[PDB]
């Protein structure tokens, strides 16, 4: 493989973030490389219906949108690199990234732009029923449990929000957390455990996602666990939202970049630059508060023009 | 027409931000009213060549893309009507908004999304060779200038940071301005006035906009004034960008929302939220920095989730 390759900008991801930084900085000639990372397209790659990315009049799959961005972005002049980055130098004038083909990569300005994967409880279950009444996203799929029940799983901030999102929406909300009360903001918590639709189960985790056959398969229960106990139940359900938090992709930059308390990279106000000149991150990596598409590839933009003034003003 | 109308969010503005904003309220059952004003899908209607939103391969015109999510809007359940908003009382709950129709609007959460329109300098020219050589963004449109020399008009922030942008795209970049020096943070204006390939014609305006017959018509030139003494001189370019700033549409907040000093409407960090409670704003409007579709397209994302949470802690 290539001993060692220069770009003016170098993007590290390939979900909406990164490609929306490429589109803009190759449109401002800096020929961007974007490298793909493990999931080209990140993680809108695992779903098949997406109806909140303003700009189609009906639904689309995941995988076919992130096709239509990889296009435009090699259209305008980027160039998507199929490799990983397994280290990054942040403190050395071009910045310097290792690929896991060996290949060094040096860059004027880097754009991060690595998500935050939703975690999963690691259930078999999870995956059969995965868009047919699992999800990880209330935002996303709340509207079709219009008048529904519905489960969420955890106990954190995230599982508060989720919950209260969908309680304004489903018929009712049964919150399963494997602890005796949450780990959330008082008065959220509060909020939410006062809504005449909202039930909690404590002490208990999902066993199990129950449902009908793959004809796809669809949610019709689950069975919770007491972990005190182990004593089992089952119950109705029609839709399970895992909510138990997101890992952002830093494993890079930990000691190296700014974080926030939960592990984010911490990036200035309306700005992506981090704590690091030169150095911009974009999109969920960043992004705890919003965590959609549009708001990464927004993210996206402002990066890439970003680090255009700021290479402007290093000449 | 109807004397009195309530929705739970109601948004000001088809643009990119408003539909948006309508696309997630509307999605988390928020019934969302759109009121169009009179651009229904705002500025981007003016332009027949996108090629930096992110999710079309292909090049776009701006009003196929403006209709797609105005029905992609009207399909998850938002309802746009066709009224521009003549006042608004910020002070009172519900907040109530009057029509032009005479219908009284209100609404538990208001998004403003009503845009900064590009000002122009007001000659008959700058219509015959829109998109055929002039043009307000140099993001938008500096890229078909590639080794091309181009007219920028301005000497503000505005002007300077175009101007500086086209410098590292075009062959040349000439600064045309009414006054004999920039009004600009003098760090930026040393640095665009020492790029080799960027010339000034200080205390000048453009006269008129030349070039070829509409068959598009294309620039070829323009004719400059010295506002001192009258006298004109004509020459050669490929492109004119007219940078003389923009105009937020706040002539409904003055002295009742937070301003900053240039004029466009004050948000939190990180967020839609104004001076009042309930009261978001987003995209152009607020948001003097980045001024893309995408931006005011992630602005309005954000705005519907905080309405929606505001909504919620109100409840
Ligand atoms: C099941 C499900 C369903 C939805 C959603 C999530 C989930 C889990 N979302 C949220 C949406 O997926 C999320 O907001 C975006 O994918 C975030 O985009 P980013 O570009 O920030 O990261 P994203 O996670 O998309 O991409 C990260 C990229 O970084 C790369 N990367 C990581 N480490 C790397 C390394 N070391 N080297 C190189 N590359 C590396 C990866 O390969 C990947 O390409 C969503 N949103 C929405 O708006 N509408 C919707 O319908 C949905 N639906
Ligand atoms: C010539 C040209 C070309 C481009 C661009 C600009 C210009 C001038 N832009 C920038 C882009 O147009 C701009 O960023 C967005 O239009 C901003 O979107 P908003 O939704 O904020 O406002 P936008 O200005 O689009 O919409 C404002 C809306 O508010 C409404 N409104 C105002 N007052 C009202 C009232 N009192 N009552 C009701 N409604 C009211 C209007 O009717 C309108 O529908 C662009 N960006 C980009 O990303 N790619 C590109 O190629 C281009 N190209
Ligand atoms: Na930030
Ligand atoms: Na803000």
């Not at 779903?47 to 961005?69: F, K, L, R």
């Not at 990596?285 to 590839?297: E, G, K, L, M």
């Given at each position: 493989?290539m001993?060692?390759?220069?770009?003016?900008?170098?993007?590290?991801?390939?979900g909406?973030?990164?490609?929306?930084?490429?589109?803009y900085?190759?449109?401002?000639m800096?020929k961007?490389?974007?490298?793909?990372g493990?999931?080209?397209?990140?993680?809108?790659?695992?779903?098949?219906?997406?109806?909140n990315?303003?700009?189609?009049?009906?639904?689309?799959?995941?995988?076919?949108?992130?096709?239509?961005?990889?296009?435009?972005?090699?259209?305008?002049?980027?160039?998507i690199?199929?490799?990983?980055?397994?280290?990054?130098?942040?403190?050395?004038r071009?910045?310097?990234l290792?690929?896991?083909s060996?290949?060094?990569?040096?860059?004027?300005?880097?754009?991060?732009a690595?998500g935050?994967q939703?975690?999963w409880?690691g259930?078999?279950?999870?995956?059969?029923?995965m868009?047919?009444?699992?999800?990880?996203?209330?935002?996303?799929?709340?509207?079709?449990?219009?008048?529904?029940?519905?489960?969420?799983?955890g106990?954190?901030?995230?599982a508060?929000?989720?919950?209260?999102?969908?309680?304004?929406?489903?018929?009712?909300?049964?919150?399963?957390?494997?602890?005796?009360?949450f780990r959330?903001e008082?008065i959220?918590?509060?909020?939410?455990?006062?809504?005449e639709?909202?039930?909690?189960?404590?002490?208990?985790?999902?066993?199990?996602?129950?449902?009908?056959?793959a004809?796809?398969?669809?949610?019709?229960?689950?069975?919770?666990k007491?972990?005190?106990?182990?004593?089992?139940?089952?119950?109705?359900?029609?839709?399970?939202?895992?909510?138990?938090?997101?890992?952002?992709?830093?494993s890079?930059?930990?000691?190296?970049?700014?974080?926030?308390?939960?592990?984010?990279?911490?990036?200035?106000?309306?700005?992506?630059?981090?704590?690091?000149?030169?150095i911009?991150?974009?999109?969920?990596?960043?992004?705890?508060?919003?965590?959609?598409?549009?708001?990464?590839?927004?993210?996206?933009?402002?990066?890439?023009?970003?680090?255009?003034?700021?290479?402007?003003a290093?000449?």
């Amino acid at each position: 493989s290539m001993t060692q390759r220069h770009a003016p900008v170098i993007v590290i991801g390939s979900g909406p973030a990164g490609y929306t930084a490429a589109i803009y900085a190759a449109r401002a000639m800096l020929k961007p490389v974007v490298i793909a990372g493990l999931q080209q397209g990140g993680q809108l790659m695992i779903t098949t219906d997406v109806e909140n990315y303003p700009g189609y009049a009906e639904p689309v799959q995941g995988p076919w949108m992130m096709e239509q961005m990889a296009r435009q972005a090699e259209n305008v002049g980027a160039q998507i690199v199929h490799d990983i980055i397994t280290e990054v130098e942040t403190t050395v004038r071009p910045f310097r990234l290792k690929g896991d083909s060996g290949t060094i990569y040096t860059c004027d300005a880097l754009i991060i732009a690595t998500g935050a994967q939703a975690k999963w409880l690691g259930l078999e279950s999870e995956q059969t029923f995965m868009g047919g009444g699992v999800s990880a996203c209330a935002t996303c799929d709340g509207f079709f449990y219009r008048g529904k029940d519905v489960v969420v799983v955890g106990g954190g901030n995230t599982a508060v929000e989720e919950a209260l999102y969908l309680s304004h929406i489903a018929k009712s909300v049964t919150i399963v957390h494997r602890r005796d009360g949450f780990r959330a903001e008082k008065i959220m918590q509060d909020r939410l455990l006062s809504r005449e639709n909202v039930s909690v189960v404590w002490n208990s985790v999902i066993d199990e996602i129950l449902g009908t056959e793959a004809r796809g398969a669809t949610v019709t229960g689950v069975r919770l666990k007491n972990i005190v106990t182990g004593e089992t139940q089952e119950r109705a359900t029609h839709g399970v939202f895992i909510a138990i938090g997101h890992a952002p992709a830093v494993s890079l930059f930990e000691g190296k970049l700014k974080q926030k308390p939960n592990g984010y990279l911490w990036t200035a106000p309306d700005s992506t630059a981090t704590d690091v000149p030169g150095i911009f991150a974009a999109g969920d990596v960043t992004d705890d508060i919003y965590r959609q598409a549009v708001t990464a590839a927004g993210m996206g933009c402002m990066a890439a023009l970003e680090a255009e003034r700021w290479l402007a003003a290093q000449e």
